[PDB]
Design an enzyme around this catalytic site. Structure first.
Site, PDB file in Angstrom:
ATOM      1  N   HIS A 183       0.764  -1.451   0.314  1.00  0.00           N
ATOM      2  CA  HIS A 183       0.652  -0.208  -0.121  1.00  0.00           C
ATOM      3  C   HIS A 183       0.870   1.708  -0.097  1.00  0.00           C
ATOM      4  CE1 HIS A 183      -3.056  -2.484   0.383  1.00  0.00           C
ATOM      5  NE2 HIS A 183      -3.089  -3.212   2.024  1.00  0.00           N
ATOM      6  N   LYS A 241      -4.422  -9.743  -7.914  1.00  0.00           N
ATOM      7  CA  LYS A 241      -4.738  -8.960  -6.961  1.00  0.00           C
ATOM      8  C   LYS A 241      -5.976  -7.898  -7.550  1.00  0.00           C
ATOM      9  CE  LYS A 241      -4.475  -6.593  -2.487  1.00  0.00           C
ATOM     10  NZ  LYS A 241      -4.218  -5.790  -1.737  1.00  0.00           N
ATOM     11  N   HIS A 262      -3.396  -2.877   7.817  1.00  0.00           N
ATOM     12  CA  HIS A 262      -4.985  -3.392   7.062  1.00  0.00           C
ATOM     13  C   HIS A 262      -5.177  -1.971   6.337  1.00  0.00           C
ATOM     14  CE1 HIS A 262      -8.121  -4.520   6.050  1.00  0.00           C
ATOM     15  NE2 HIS A 262      -8.444  -4.321   6.211  1.00  0.00           N
ATOM     16  N   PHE A 263      -5.329  -2.346   5.268  1.00  0.00           N
ATOM     17  CA  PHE A 263      -5.851  -0.757   3.826  1.00  0.00           C
ATOM     18  C   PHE A 263      -7.548  -1.509   4.239  1.00  0.00           C
ATOM     19  CE2 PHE A 263      -5.205   2.886   1.957  1.00  0.00           C
ATOM     20  CZ  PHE A 263      -6.360   3.069   1.639  1.00  0.00           C
ATOM     21  N   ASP A 264      -8.754  -0.366   4.700  1.00  0.00           N
ATOM     22  CA  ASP A 264      -9.522  -0.934   4.886  1.00  0.00           C
ATOM     23  C   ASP A 264     -10.321  -0.288   3.982  1.00  0.00           C
ATOM     24  OD1 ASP A 264     -11.171  -2.529   7.329  1.00  0.00           O
ATOM     25  OD2 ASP A 264     -12.641  -0.812   7.275  1.00  0.00           O
TER      26      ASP A 264
HETATM   27  N1  LIG Z   1      -9.534  -4.353  11.755  1.00  0.00           N
HETATM   28  C1  LIG Z   1      -7.904  -5.273  11.356  1.00  0.00           C
HETATM   29  N2  LIG Z   1      -6.576  -5.819  12.577  1.00  0.00           N
HETATM   30  C2  LIG Z   1      -5.483  -5.822  11.904  1.00  0.00           C
HETATM   31  N3  LIG Z   1      -5.997  -6.209  11.086  1.00  0.00           N
HETATM   32  C3  LIG Z   1      -6.972  -6.688   9.919  1.00  0.00           C
HETATM   33  C4  LIG Z   1      -8.214  -6.557  10.494  1.00  0.00           C
HETATM   34  N4  LIG Z   1      -9.079  -6.527   9.918  1.00  0.00           N
HETATM   35  C5  LIG Z   1      -8.655  -6.600   7.746  1.00  0.00           C
HETATM   36  N5  LIG Z   1      -7.418  -7.321   8.657  1.00  0.00           N
HETATM   37  C6  LIG Z   1      -6.440  -7.634   7.854  1.00  0.00           C
HETATM   38  O1  LIG Z   1      -5.205  -7.357   7.258  1.00  0.00           O
HETATM   39  C7  LIG Z   1      -4.557  -8.238   6.005  1.00  0.00           C
HETATM   40  C8  LIG Z   1      -4.103  -7.190   4.600  1.00  0.00           C
HETATM   41  O2  LIG Z   1      -5.344  -6.719   4.273  1.00  0.00           O
HETATM   42  P1  LIG Z   1      -5.185  -5.772   3.251  1.00  0.00           P
HETATM   43  O3  LIG Z   1      -4.789  -6.167   2.338  1.00  0.00           O
HETATM   44  O4  LIG Z   1      -4.362  -4.149   3.667  1.00  0.00           O
HETATM   45  N6  LIG Z   1      -6.779  -4.914   3.259  1.00  0.00           N
HETATM   46  C9  LIG Z   1      -7.824  -5.720   1.985  1.00  0.00           C
HETATM   47  C10 LIG Z   1      -8.781  -5.017   1.416  1.00  0.00           C
HETATM   48  C11 LIG Z   1      -9.691  -5.409   3.102  1.00  0.00           C
HETATM   49  C12 LIG Z   1     -10.397  -4.405   3.210  1.00  0.00           C
HETATM   50  C13 LIG Z   1     -11.872  -5.151   4.564  1.00  0.00           C
HETATM   51  C14 LIG Z   1     -11.250  -6.417   5.351  1.00  0.00           C
HETATM   52  C15 LIG Z   1     -10.392  -6.661   4.271  1.00  0.00           C
HETATM   53  C16 LIG Z   1      -9.439  -6.382   3.110  1.00  0.00           C
HETATM   54  C17 LIG Z   1      -6.656  -5.321   0.220  1.00  0.00           C
HETATM   55  O5  LIG Z   1      -5.966  -4.913   0.568  1.00  0.00           O
HETATM   56  O6  LIG Z   1      -7.266  -6.443  -0.618  1.00  0.00           O
HETATM   57  C18 LIG Z   1      -6.151  -8.542   5.295  1.00  0.00           C
HETATM   58  O7  LIG Z   1      -5.572  -9.823   5.560  1.00  0.00           O
HETATM   59  C19 LIG Z   1      -6.831  -8.630   6.789  1.00  0.00           C
HETATM   60  O8  LIG Z   1      -7.406  -9.353   6.471  1.00  0.00           O
HETATM   61 CL   LIG Z   2     -11.787  -4.933   8.187  1.00  0.00          CL
END
Ligand SMILES: Nc1ncnc2c1ncn2[C@@H]1O[C@H](COP(=O)(O)N[C@@H](Cc2ccccc2)C(=O)O)[C@@H](O)[C@H]1O
Ligand SMILES: [Cl-]
EC number: 4.6.1.18
Length: 124
Positions: A12, A41, A119-121
């Site tokens: 990110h 992705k 994580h990017f939400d």
């Molecule tokens: N509150 C939490 N604190 C700690 N980590 C958590 C939490 N929420 C989700 N993650 C986890 O961090 C990992 C990196 O995510 P990313 O790859 O950065 N984001 C996803 C988008 C996304 C948006 C919402 C929900 C899921 C996916 C993406 O880029 O395709 C993912 O595998 C999540 O399961």
């Molecule tokens: Cl989340």
């Protein structure tokens, strides 16, 4: 093998440019960050701010995450971001992406010590 923090930076962070310069940005960047290695992705956002500025979001507006945890934070300021989304005709291993440059608030989840994004939400 990779910390969550490091994976966040790989997926990110792009502090090297101030914006996507061309409609080819996502094609190049998804490849160079290993987001096309095994599969394409589908959707990914890059942030064009300093790492310090992004890490500081962990001390800004606390919000719920999409998963219902409450360790998410919204940036007070808008940031320069690029949204990368696979095209409808994209097929691995020739992954193809549309680039959309914008200024938006980001929402990240933070964890650990140091307390940094893992994580990017979303962007809003
Ligand atoms: N509150 C939490 N604190 C700690 N980590 C958590 C939490 N929420 C989700 N993650 C986890 O961090 C990992 C990196 O995510 P990313 O790859 O950065 N984001 C996803 C988008 C996304 C948006 C919402 C929900 C899921 C996916 C993406 O880029 O395709 C993912 O595998 C999540 O399961
Ligand atoms: Cl989340």
């Amino acid at each position: 093998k990779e910390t969550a923090a490091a994976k966040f930076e790989r997926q990110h962070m792009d502090s090297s440019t101030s914006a996507a310069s061309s409609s080819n940005y996502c094609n190049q960047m998804m490849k160079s960050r290993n987001l096309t290695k095994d599969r394409c992705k589908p959707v990914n956002t890059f942030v064009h701010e300093s790492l310090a500025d992004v890490q500081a979001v962990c001390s800004q507006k606390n919000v719920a995450c999409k998963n219902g945890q409450t360790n998410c934070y919204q940036s007070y300021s808008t940031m320069s971001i690029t949204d990368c989304r696979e095209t409808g005709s994209s097929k691995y291993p020739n992954c193809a992406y549309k680039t959309t440059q914008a200024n938006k608030h980001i929402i990240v989840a933070c964890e650990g010590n140091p307390y940094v994004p893992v994580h990017f939400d979303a962007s809003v």
